[PDB]
Amino acid sequence: TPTYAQWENAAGVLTAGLNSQQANTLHAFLDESRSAALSTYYIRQVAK
Amino acid sequence: MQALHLLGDKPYLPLSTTWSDPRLDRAADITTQN
Amino acid sequence: SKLENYTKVMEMLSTFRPSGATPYHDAYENVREVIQLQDPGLEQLNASPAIAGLMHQASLLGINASISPELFNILTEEITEGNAEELYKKNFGNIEPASLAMPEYLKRYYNLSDEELSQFIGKASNFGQQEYSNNQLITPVVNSSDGTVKVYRITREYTTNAYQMDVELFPFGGENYRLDYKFKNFYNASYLSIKLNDKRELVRTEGAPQVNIEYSANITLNTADISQPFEIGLTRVLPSGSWAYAAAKFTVEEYNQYSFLLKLNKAIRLSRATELSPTILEGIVRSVNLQLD
Amino acid sequence: FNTPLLNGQYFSTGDEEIDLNSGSTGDWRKTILKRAFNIDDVSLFRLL
Numbered sequence: 001t002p003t004y005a006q007w008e009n010a011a012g013v014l015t016a017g018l019n020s021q022q023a024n025t026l027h028a029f030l031d032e033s034r035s036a037a038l039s040t041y042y043i044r045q046v047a048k
Numbered sequence: 049m050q051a052l053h054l055l056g057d058k059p060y061l062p063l064s065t066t067w068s069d070p071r072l073d074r075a076a077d078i079t080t081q082n
Numbered sequence: 083s084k085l086e087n088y089t090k091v092m093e094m095l096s097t098f099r100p101s102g103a104t105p106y107h108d109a110y111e112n113v114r115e116v117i118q119l120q121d122p123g124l125e126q127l128n129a130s131p132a133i134a135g136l137m138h139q140a141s142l143l144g145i146n147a148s149i150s151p152e153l154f155n156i157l158t159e160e161i162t163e164g165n166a167e168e169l170y171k172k173n174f175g176n177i178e179p180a181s182l183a184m185p186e187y188l189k190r191y192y193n194l195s196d197e198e199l200s201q202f203i204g205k206a207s208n209f210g211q212q213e214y215s216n217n218q219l220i221t222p223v224v225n226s227s228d229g230t231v232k233v234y235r236i237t238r239e240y241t242t243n244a245y246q247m248d249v250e251l252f253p254f255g256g257e258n259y260r261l262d263y264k265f266k267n268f269y270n271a272s273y274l275s276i277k278l279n280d281k282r283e284l285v286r287t288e289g290a291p292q293v294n295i296e297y298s299a300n301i302t303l304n305t306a307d308i309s310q311p312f313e314i315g316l317t318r319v320l321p322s323g324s325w326a327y328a329a330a331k332f333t334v335e336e337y338n339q340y341s342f343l344l345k346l347n348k349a350i351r352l353s354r355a356t357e358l359s360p361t362i363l364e365g366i367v368r369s370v371n372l373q374l375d
Numbered sequence: 376f377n378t379p380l381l382n383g384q385y386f387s388t389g390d391e392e393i394d395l396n397s398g399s400t401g402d403w404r405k406t407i408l409k410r411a412f413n414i415d416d417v418s419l420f421r422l423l
Contacts, residue, residue, distance in 0.1 A: 008382060010113055022120075033106065036103055040103035
């Protein structure tokens with residue numbers, strides 16, 4: 001199975017081809033997903 | 049948000065329960081009080 | 083976390099299976115979003131047979147369904163009694179299954195909606211075992227005067243004339259049960275009488291029960307009953323007053339929630355990842371296995 | 376170059392050496408260059 005570095009490399013190569021408008025939408029979607037994941041992890045593992 | 053925490057936790061209401069789909073005939077006699 | 087750089091943190095997050103909306107594979111999400119921007123639906127990929135054939139179908143296709151590789155490891159797992167007691171350690175860690183049994187706590191944990199949770203809790207009657215195995219049935223039951231989920235083990239024990247029949251019991255509510263039974267031999271009953279033990283007659287059916295027919299009854303069994311290793315005594319009474327009596331005991335035990343919560347977890351995470359209705363997934367899973375697995 | 380940040384890596388002038396060969400499959404710095412110039416690897420080498 002592909003290791004995380006392979007995935008991150010593919011993510012970067014694929015992202016380099018996008019335009020400003022599509023990059024803006026991609027970054028907004030990524031930020032929303034990251035916020036949800038980080039909130040759940042913080043609640044489970046860091047909250048007192 | 050000020051009104052939101054005043055209302056508090058929305059109550060959870062278990063969708064199905066002990067109620068057993070009774071016949072109208074029998075529901076009538078159960079409901080008919082002494 | 084003792085992690086200094088961003089990518090080590092996202093590697094940690096990509097495998098943090100014990101939390102309720104991780105695992106979150108960020109590079110995979112970036113790749114999926116970039117693909118669905120640049121070529122929605124892989125029309126150009128599928129229009130090129132060589133590229134599509136360098137991939138497996140299930141790999142390109144599983145990027146549509148938003149199944150991450152760790153979520154694929156979660157969903158693939160062979161949940162059974164004899165590993166559920168430690169796969170609970172893998173998949174939930176430190177939250178007690180008694181707390182996670184409460185619908186409010188679990189809904190907060192998955193950040194579900196009320197109507198979204200309600201259909202999974204209806205589906206919970208399917209989440210159990212679908213048929214008896216080793217004369218045992220282990221099942222969740224609502225009994226929900228407080229919403230809570232309780233898992234019951236029913237253990238069958240054929241006591242009397244087991245050559246007459248098979249008999250099976252399937253709860254659906256608090257002190258509310260379906261009893262199923264299927265005869266092996268024919269006796270021309272004037273009526274069929276069925277009792278708690280040979281004592282409290284729970285149902286009676288007129289005429290002769292036939293061979294190879296699965297009969298059913300929405301019986302009730304009460305606390306003072308199911309605390310016992312009670313018998314269920316069935317009795318085909320012939321017009322002569324002779325009978326093919328047969329019976330089995332049914333021990334009712336309260337049981338751990340592990341195998342229930344692991345199946346509910348698989349169902350919730352699959353439904354959320356594929357944005358498919360739980361009814362659709364239930365209609366798909368039955369087309370592979372008669373056990374919901 | 377620096378915005379948006381790519382995988383939490385900050386780009387700055389340094390003494391390290393970056394390869395512009397298209398078939399070399401360079402590191403994240405090459406991806407930063409491609410994203411900044413909005414060009415692919417082959418055209419990047421052609422521009423070089």
